[PDB]
Amino acid sequence: QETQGQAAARAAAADLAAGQDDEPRILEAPAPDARRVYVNDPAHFAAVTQQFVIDGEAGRVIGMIDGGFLPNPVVADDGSFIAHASTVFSRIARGERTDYVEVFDPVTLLPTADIELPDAPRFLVGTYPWMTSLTPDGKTLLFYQFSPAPAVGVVDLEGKAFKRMLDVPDCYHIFPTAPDTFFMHCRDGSLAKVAFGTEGTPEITHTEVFHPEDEFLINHPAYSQKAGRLVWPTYTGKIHQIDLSSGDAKFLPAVEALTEAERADGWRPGGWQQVAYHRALDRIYLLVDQRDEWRHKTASRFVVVLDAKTGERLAKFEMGHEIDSINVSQDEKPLLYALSTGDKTLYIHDAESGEELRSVNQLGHGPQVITTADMG
Amino acid sequence: AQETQGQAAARAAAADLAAGQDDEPRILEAPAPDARRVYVNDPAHFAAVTQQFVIDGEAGRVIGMIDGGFLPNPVVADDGSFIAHASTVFSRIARGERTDYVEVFDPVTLLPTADIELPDAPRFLVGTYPWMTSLTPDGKTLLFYQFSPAPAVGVVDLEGKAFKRMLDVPDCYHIFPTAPDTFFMHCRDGSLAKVAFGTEGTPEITHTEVFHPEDEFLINHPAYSQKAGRLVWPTYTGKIHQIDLSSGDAKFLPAVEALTEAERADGWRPGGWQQVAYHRALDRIYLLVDQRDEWRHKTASRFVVVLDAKTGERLAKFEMGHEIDSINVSQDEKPLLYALSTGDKTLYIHDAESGEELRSVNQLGHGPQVITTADMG
Amino acid sequence: ADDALAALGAQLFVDPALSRNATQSCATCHDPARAFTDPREGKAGLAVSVGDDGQSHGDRNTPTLGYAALVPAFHRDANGKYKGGQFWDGRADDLKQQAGQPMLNPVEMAMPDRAAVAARLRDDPAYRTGFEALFGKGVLDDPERAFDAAAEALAAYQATGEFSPFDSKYDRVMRGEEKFTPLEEFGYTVFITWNCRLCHMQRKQGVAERETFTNFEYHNIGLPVNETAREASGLGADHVDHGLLARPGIEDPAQSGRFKVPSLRNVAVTGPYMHNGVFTDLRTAILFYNKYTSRRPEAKINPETGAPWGEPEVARNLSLAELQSGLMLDDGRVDALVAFLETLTDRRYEPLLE
Amino acid sequence: ADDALAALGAQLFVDPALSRNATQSCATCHDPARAFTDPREGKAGLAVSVGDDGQSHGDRNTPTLGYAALVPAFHRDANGKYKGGQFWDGRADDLKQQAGQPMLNPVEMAMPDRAAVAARLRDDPAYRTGFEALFGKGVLDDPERAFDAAAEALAAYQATGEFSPFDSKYDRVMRGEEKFTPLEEFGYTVFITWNCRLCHMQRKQGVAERETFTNFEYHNIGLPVNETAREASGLGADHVDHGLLARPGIEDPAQSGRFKVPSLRNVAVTGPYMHNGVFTDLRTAILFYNKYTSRRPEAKINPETGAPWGEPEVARNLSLAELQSGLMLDDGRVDALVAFLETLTDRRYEPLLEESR
Amino acid sequence: TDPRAKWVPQDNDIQACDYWRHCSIDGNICDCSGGSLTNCPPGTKLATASWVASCYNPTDGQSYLIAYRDCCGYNVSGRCPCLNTEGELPVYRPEFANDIIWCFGAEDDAMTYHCTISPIVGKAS
Amino acid sequence: TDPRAKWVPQDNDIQACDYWRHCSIDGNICDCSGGSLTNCPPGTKLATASWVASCYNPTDGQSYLIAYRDCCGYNVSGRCPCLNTEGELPVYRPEFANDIIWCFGAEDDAMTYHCTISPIVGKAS
Numbered sequence A: 001q002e003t004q005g006q007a008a009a010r011a012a013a014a015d016l017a018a019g020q021d022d023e024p025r026i027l028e029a030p031a032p033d034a035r036r037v038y039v040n041d042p043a044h045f046a047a048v049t050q051q052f053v054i055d056g057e058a059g060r061v062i063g064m065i066d067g068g069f070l071p072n073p074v075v076a077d078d079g080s081f082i083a084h085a086s087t088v089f090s091r092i093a094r095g096e097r098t099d100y101v102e103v104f105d106p107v108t109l110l111p112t113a114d115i116e117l118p119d120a121p122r123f124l125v126g127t128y129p130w131m132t133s134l135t136p137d138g139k140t141l142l143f144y145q146f147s148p149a150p151a152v153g154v155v156d157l158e159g160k161a162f163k164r165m166l167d168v169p170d171c172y173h174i175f176p177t178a179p180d181t182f183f184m185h186c187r188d189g190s191l192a193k194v195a196f197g198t199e200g201t202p203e204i205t206h207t208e209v210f211h212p213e214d215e216f217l218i219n220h221p222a223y224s225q226k227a228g229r230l231v232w233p234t235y236t237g238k239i240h241q242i243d244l245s246s247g248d249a250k251f252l253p254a255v256e257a258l259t260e261a262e263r264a265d266g267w268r269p270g271g272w273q274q275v276a277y278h279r280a281l282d283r284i285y286l287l288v289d290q291r292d293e294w295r296h297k298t299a300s301r302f303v304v305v306l307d308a309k310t311g312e313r314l315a316k317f318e319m320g321h322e323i324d325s326i327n328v329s330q331d332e333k334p335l336l337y338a339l340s341t342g343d344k345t346l347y348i349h350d351a352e353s354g355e356e357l358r359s360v361n362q363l364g365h366g367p368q369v370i371t372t373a374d375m376g
Numbered sequence B: 001a002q003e004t005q006g007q008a009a010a011r012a013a014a015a016d017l018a019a020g021q022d023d024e025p026r027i028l029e030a031p032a033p034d035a036r037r038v039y040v041n042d043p044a045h046f047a048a049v050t051q052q053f054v055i056d057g058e059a060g061r062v063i064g065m066i067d068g069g070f071l072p073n074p075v076v077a078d079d080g081s082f083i084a085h086a087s088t089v090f091s092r093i094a095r096g097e098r099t100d101y102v103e104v105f106d107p108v109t110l111l112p113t114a115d116i117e118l119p120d121a122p123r124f125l126v127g128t129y130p131w132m133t134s135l136t137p138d139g140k141t142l143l144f145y146q147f148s149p150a151p152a153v154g155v156v157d158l159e160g161k162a163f164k165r166m167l168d169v170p171d172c173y174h175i176f177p178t179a180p181d182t183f184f185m186h187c188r189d190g191s192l193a194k195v196a197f198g199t200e201g202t203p204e205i206t207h208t209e210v211f212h213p214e215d216e217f218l219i220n221h222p223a224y225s226q227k228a229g230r231l232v233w234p235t236y237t238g239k240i241h242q243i244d245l246s247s248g249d250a251k252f253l254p255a256v257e258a259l260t261e262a263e264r265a266d267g268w269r270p271g272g273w274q275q276v277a278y279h280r281a282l283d284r285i286y287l288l289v290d291q292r293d294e295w296r297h298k299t300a301s302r303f304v305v306v307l308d309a310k311t312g313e314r315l316a317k318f319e320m321g322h323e324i325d326s327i328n329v330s331q332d333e334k335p336l337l338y339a340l341s342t343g344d345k346t347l348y349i350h351d352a353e354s355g356e357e358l359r360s361v362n363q364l365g366h367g368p369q370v371i372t373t374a375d376m377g
Numbered sequence C: 001a002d003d004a005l006a007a008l009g010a011q012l013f014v015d016p017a018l019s020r021n022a023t024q025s026c027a028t029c030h031d032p033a034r035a036f037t038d039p040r041e042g043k044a045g046l047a048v049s050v051g052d053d054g055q056s057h058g059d060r061n062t063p064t065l066g067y068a069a070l071v072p073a074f075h076r077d078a079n080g081k082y083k084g085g086q087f088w089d090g091r092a093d094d095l096k097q098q099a100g101q102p103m104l105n106p107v108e109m110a111m112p113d114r115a116a117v118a119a120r121l122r123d124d125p126a127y128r129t130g131f132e133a134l135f136g137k138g139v140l141d142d143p144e145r146a147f148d149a150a151a152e153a154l155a156a157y158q159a160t161g162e163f164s165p166f167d168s169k170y171d172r173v174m175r176g177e178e179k180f181t182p183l184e185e186f187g188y189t190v191f192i193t194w195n196c197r198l199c200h201m202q203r204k205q206g207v208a209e210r211e212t213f214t215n216f217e218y219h220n221i222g223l224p225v226n227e228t229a230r231e232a233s234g235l236g237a238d239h240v241d242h243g244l245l246a247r248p249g250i251e252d253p254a255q256s257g258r259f260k261v262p263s264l265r266n267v268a269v270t271g272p273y274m275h276n277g278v279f280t281d282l283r284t285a286i287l288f289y290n291k292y293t294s295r296r297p298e299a300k301i302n303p304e305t306g307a308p309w310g311e312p313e314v315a316r317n318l319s320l321a322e323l324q325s326g327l328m329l330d331d332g333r334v335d336a337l338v339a340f341l342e343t344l345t346d347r348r349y350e351p352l353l354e
Numbered sequence D: 001a002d003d004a005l006a007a008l009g010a011q012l013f014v015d016p017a018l019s020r021n022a023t024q025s026c027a028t029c030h031d032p033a034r035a036f037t038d039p040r041e042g043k044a045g046l047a048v049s050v051g052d053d054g055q056s057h058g059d060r061n062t063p064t065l066g067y068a069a070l071v072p073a074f075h076r077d078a079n080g081k082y083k084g085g086q087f088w089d090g091r092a093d094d095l096k097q098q099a100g101q102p103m104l105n106p107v108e109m110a111m112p113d114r115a116a117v118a119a120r121l122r123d124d125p126a127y128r129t130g131f132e133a134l135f136g137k138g139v140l141d142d143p144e145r146a147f148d149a150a151a152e153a154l155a156a157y158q159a160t161g162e163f164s165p166f167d168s169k170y171d172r173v174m175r176g177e178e179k180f181t182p183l184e185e186f187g188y189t190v191f192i193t194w195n196c197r198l199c200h201m202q203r204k205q206g207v208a209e210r211e212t213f214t215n216f217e218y219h220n221i222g223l224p225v226n227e228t229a230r231e232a233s234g235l236g237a238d239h240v241d242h243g244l245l246a247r248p249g250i251e252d253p254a255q256s257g258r259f260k261v262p263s264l265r266n267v268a269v270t271g272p273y274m275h276n277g278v279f280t281d282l283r284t285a286i287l288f289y290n291k292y293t294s295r296r297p298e299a300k301i302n303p304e305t306g307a308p309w310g311e312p313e314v315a316r317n318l319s320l321a322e323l324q325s326g327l328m329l330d331d332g333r334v335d336a337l338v339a340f341l342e343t344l345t346d347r348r349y350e351p352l353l354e355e356s357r
Numbered sequence E, F: 001t002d003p004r005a006k007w008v009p010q011d012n013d014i015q016a017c018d019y020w021r022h023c024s025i026d027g028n029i030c031d032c033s034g035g036s037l038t039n040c041p042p043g044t045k046l047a048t049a050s051w052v053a054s055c056y057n058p059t060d061g062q063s064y065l066i067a068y069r070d071c072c073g074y075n076v077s078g079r080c081p082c083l084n085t086e087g088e089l090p091v092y093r094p095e096f097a098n099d100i101i102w103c104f105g106a107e108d109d110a111m112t113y114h115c116t117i118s119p120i121v122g123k124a125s
């Protein structure tokens, strides 16, 4: 029953009573572990923003990181560093723009690298976790550039230098598969494989077109780098699962998140990170509610969970809150994190049952993106 | 009753569509600054970035905004010609290299017309006190307080757009300019210090007599009318010190009590942020008061007492009907009483005469605290 | 009346007796079967047209007369942008003031003077009758009146439904009669969200009643000289075409190098393109806009030549705020735009597309 | 026994028979009438003391023995900070290890060895009786036992309330038996809010039961050489007092130039200050701290000489993180601190305050 | 006030998230920070790029192309925030996608988002 | 919850604005952003300056001197904001004034305000 503030009051009262001395100092965050969760607050397009580091187990804020305009957070699956691509301006929201990558020690949260990105090349967009991405080797960071044309930037986190821009066709999102390759999704409905040498036009391969012109795939597909599973919902809950381990795209059978019936009574996915994917459990979680066709960014009060292999509904949770974003710890017995932009609160749920265990409120201004490491 | 501004716009857009009326999408200019423009600064409870809202108080309309850095000090030239602020930014949001600077802005296009670096990060970072950064009366100099390593005042030339010099001062606080080269400060010992400064040389520092006991506490947001040279300084108890600086030296005016002793006996005290406003033309004092314990002096208040600054006579006691932290008045005839609630992030705009709420402007940032009006007339 | 007037105009427009040698009429250069442009091969391809005399070539490409009647009379608007008028440099005020100039131009129809024009009108008993009924008895015996009245008939003729039929597929789609192909629609969406609509739409906002895909303004889009056309013009390699600044009474140096935003109606069939016919294909003309946005090496190379576009004929007053949109048109979008532009072809020229 | 051992120490403490020439006792340099410090004038003023030979000067100022019994034995804590011990460089572990040293130090009391000390103790029948009752028969016959017994008697004596009475005004005020003047109360507030408290308060947080205004740590505050004392000591122009690094067993070059934080108790009456007695006046010791914070030129000038403080004897390992507080003490705050530091004077030395004042 | 319900366009108040032209607006209505329906506030820079949407005008039953344009180079206004997504397509159909900061072509390379205007560029289709 | 009522200290929850040691805190309680009652969160820099107050501890009947210290170099946490002013004096008695950002002495020249700690430094007289 005892809250963290209450236990803290008692330990403090006891140190006083016992005359215990202690040095006021800078704490180290607890080592990164499976239950650590990161909430990025893009702050409704504010020029500066915050990332909260949260111990999902205690539901405690264990640290914070400041970012610039619409920063792209990345979290190394192995827990050895976090980074973000961020954007600042010499006068708040105006003047010279600096895009840069910063890499942080995940216990002291000190920046360990600060890497300028030439020619202001970040794509400035509501936060899509897969617009900037770590290579499996953690040595490279790839970021998408929209203007003047789709392109992908290569950042060497090891030599701490920007390398170059890759010229790509008309495509979007970045899913690294290897130290020199990543997939993107194209306008003609294929995925493009991009293999980049050290130099030259990367070599670019298109898959087959895998969805009609009038089929719409969401901005926030779940991608599990370690499983190589690209999980991609459409507006209707049709989920394209793409296996990307093997270095080429095997298209997995397409699946439906809602029942053909349910979509008749207006059940649709909606929110921000509408989908979570648990690697070892091989499960999809999807934020859903009853909504008009064109309310696809609104909060959802329900989550459905379905086997990634069969597509069978494994659960339906009434979340008890307006949830915009979901994610899950990738440990065994995962937490299902359910971020409400409106309440600014991370509701931390048991992913198996859907019981609300705890929550951390006061998470910025309009928190949107939940990131977790995949440590196992 | 009556048509909101968003309703009036819908109606006029519809009429232009219907009549095939063309118009070029462009950058608006703000309406010319006037007596009813009001600026509300939002220190955003110490956030590294902050906003000021430029408001037409007559219409209750946001007509502009200006971005700032960490706990900027806004100033508004009384004649409407410009606004400016001293501001602090850092190269990586709230860390790395600190740059303090002053920006001057055109008050119609809101564009910066000057960006003046302050060397050695010399700003006092404190919850916004209007009189910790101050324009001289001619608008050519900006003076900013520094606390660390010691009390000092930085002088910034807005006309040549350059930082000039730090002045060493005694253990004193706030900057009430009274002349292109003079200002007053309030000292720990209970006096005021007059600081006269040249381009170079030891400033000429003179102390008045101690005007309050060590046990009477003068609040951090005295009202100061530069044009009247009136410094209106409440204490914790609602006792109001008035100092007339208009002869360029300090004359101590008789103390008035904002609250009666029955009220004081029953726990009425001032409280809030900008507790006190002073209407120059009416020579009236407005004080946010409420029943409160003595150490709750930064909490919002729900009442404004209006008292005649000469006699101390109470003229009204308004029930503001909201949780108000800061007040200020327009300086024209028939003034507006601006009632800013940090909690509500809303500027309530009242008729200063009847106290009636007239309209409001909401969604003013995260923790708006400071209201500034130009005294134009 | 206005009918009869236009019918007299129609007579004159195909009459070669208004040229020095009677070898050439308005319709020779503005051939009705080519959307009122010149199909004739000259020394510089179809970049420029040849006069009556057989060897005189112009320095500008012959524009279509379709939809020319929707252009307002030349004027500076309150934001200080010049708008409207006729010729690529706006030097004529309106169609009426324009009509006469080819008759008298020595490099075009080359009549010595108004009275020689008048004499030719007398030669035709049909004109005495046609003119006299509209402008009164003796109209043809007076060179001034004859010439102005001929210009008036021509202007009336060009203002008829026949020049501006609004029956392109674009028009039909906006009337709900037909739909665009997915590609045409993509191209329309691209046209109206990218920088093209900042110049090639009548209005800044709201719906135009008779859109002609031009705002009638003047812009220097930084085009290079046309090599052969300039040679063929005999205007010399020292010559600079200053566009709008050449309009008498335009003295403002900012207008140097600016040309009227052409109407894009029929654009598919009136190649070659630009004021000087420098680009033969529509695609090429579209691609020219990427030299301002694209970082890629191809941006810089005219694909018709395989070489640098060339320095602007006039290096200043480039419309950079507009041309530098920050976004590059990919292959697909350039496709989409071609598709969209072809929908601006009038019905009777729909057979000219291949 | 607990009383008798201190009682024996009391006698040894005042007995000049423990010095070569019999001129000098502990009390000579640790004068009880001067808060256990040396009022005597030497070639370096009061900065350093003169040994039994009447010629030799030490290189460090003689510190108070008041409250020295509250210092913990010398140790390294878990954060790698050395704490406690005796002498300015912590080279003695505790009072008992310290006590025999002045005795054998040719610069101080200068007995040639343990055997000469024992022989002295022997000649006095009271010692033979006093020592024997506490340490056993024949104790005075065994130089090692006699010398260690003497050190222990002396250590026990310095632990009596006579040395740490806690009856300063400050103590009286913390007991609620009186109040600080306004100046004192402001001094106190400054002391606890400014950087002083990061070194001169027993604890990092919480309340100490017998505060002696030192954390017992070792800091190099960047003091210059005391030229006259260093001349008097004869140690050489090239000599560096490495402070804690001189303790045998300390090798870490980061400890060079660090000295034990002294208790501020009786600071008012035990001038001159610092380990080499470089500053005569209390206020000068306080002002010295402004050299890290103030930008005014005056902050760099020792007010007692009118010259720069001088380059640090040891320019490395300065406690810059604590010293560079970003805030300068104005004169009001320095006056307040003097007044506060004077409340730290034991009752019996309160009369000495007038002359310092 | 039910966020998942059909969006109900009104032609009566532009500062409301249900004003008909805001049908695919993302961010803040410029009219609330000193712009107007189709003009930027002072100090900001008007982008030339846009996302478009066909928006249904209740008042005449006609459907208009709204090409949204961003006023850039200020921190987000914080006033009258709105996010509607009528016709809104995902990012690979950028012409209709509204998460993008459509600040391209803004003067001074301004790319920070302040608010969005809602001008009509044509009739739909 | 009546903001104007006399503040009533509790000694049972340090995250609440009535916790007894927070009697003159201004800002955010560092325990809410990854620090603790008397330690700063990772990444921030502990100041050496402080303002003080004498705070009554209802557990022991004693008043203690609480020398507040800021954790600096981060934007304001935004969690557990609190403003109490027991004994709080105006800026001219800066020892006791709590609008000042007390980040002096923080490493790396950190002066931005993230949150405040409430260590005891003595008993009150």
Ligand code: HEC
Pocket (backbone or CB within 6 Å): C013, C024, C025, C026, C027, C028, C029, C030, C049, C050, C051, C052, C058, C060, C061, C062, C063, C064, C065, C068, C085, C086, C087, C088, C089, C095, C098, C099, C100, C102, C103, C107, C108, C109, C154
């Ligand atoms: C080839 C020798 C031509 C003959 C014979 C006629 N026209 Fe022409 N036309 C020609 C050129 C090369 C140009 C543009 C030259 C320039 O200085 O820009 C034109 C232009 C017009 C226009 C303006 C159209 C517009 O700006 O979009 C009009 C209305 C026009 N011409 C009409 C016209 C008439 C009525 C003629 C018979 C008298 C006539 N032209 C002859 C090429 C030639």
Ligand code: HEC
Pocket (backbone or CB within 6 Å): C194, C195, C196, C197, C198, C199, C200, C218, C219, C220, C221, C223, C258, C259, C260, C261, C262, C263, C264, C267, C270, C272, C273, C274, C275, C276, C282, C285, C286, C289, C319, C322, C323, C337
């Ligand atoms: C104003 C800055 C413009 C923008 C943006 C675009 N166009 Fe344009 N166009 C413009 C002018 C002034 C001219 C004539 C230039 C000259 O000196 O000759 C043009 C010309 C064209 C043409 C040729 C039409 C013809 O030759 O009859 C085409 C096909 C064309 N423009 C298309 C086009 C497209 C697709 C644009 C968006 C990518 C575009 N233009 C932008 C003025 C401006």
Ligand code: HEC
Pocket (backbone or CB within 6 Å): D013, D024, D025, D026, D027, D028, D029, D030, D049, D050, D051, D052, D058, D060, D061, D062, D063, D064, D065, D068, D085, D086, D087, D088, D089, D095, D098, D099, D100, D102, D103, D107, D108, D109, D154
């Ligand atoms: C002058 C010749 C002295 C006589 C005789 C004695 N002491 Fe002393 N004392 C002296 C100096 C110069 C110093 C500092 C030397 C250094 O290297 O730091 C000391 C120090 C002590 C201490 C340590 C106190 C502290 O570190 O704070 C103690 C406990 C001490 N002295 C005790 C002591 C006793 C018991 C003596 C007679 C046996 C004695 N001192 C003689 C100067 C002189």
Ligand code: HEC
Pocket (backbone or CB within 6 Å): D194, D195, D196, D197, D198, D199, D200, D218, D219, D220, D221, D223, D258, D259, D260, D261, D262, D263, D264, D267, D270, D272, D273, D274, D275, D276, D282, D285, D286, D289, D319, D322, D323, D337
């Ligand atoms: C650790 C970095 C310290 C800080 C901060 C302050 N003091 Fe200090 N003090 C310190 C040491 C290590 C020493 C001895 C230095 C040496 O090598 O001799 C001192 C000494 C004093 C003294 C002299 C005491 C005596 O000689 O017996 C005084 C009067 C003193 N210190 C006061 C003082 C005050 C008032 C401070 C805040 C302004 C302060 N010190 C800070 C270690 C440190």
Ligand SMILES: [Ca+2]
Pocket (backbone or CB within 6 Å): C037, C061, C062, C063, C064, C270, C271, C272, C273, C274, C277
């Ligand atoms: Ca042509």
Ligand SMILES: [Ca+2]
Pocket (backbone or CB within 6 Å): D037, D061, D062, D063, D064, D270, D271, D272, D273, D274, D277
């Ligand atoms: Ca001494």
Ligand code: NA
Pocket (backbone or CB within 6 Å): D044, D047, D226, D227, D228, D229, D278
């Ligand atoms: Na000396």
Ligand code: NA
Pocket (backbone or CB within 6 Å): D244, D245, D246, D247, D248, D249, D250, D251
């Ligand atoms: Na050693």
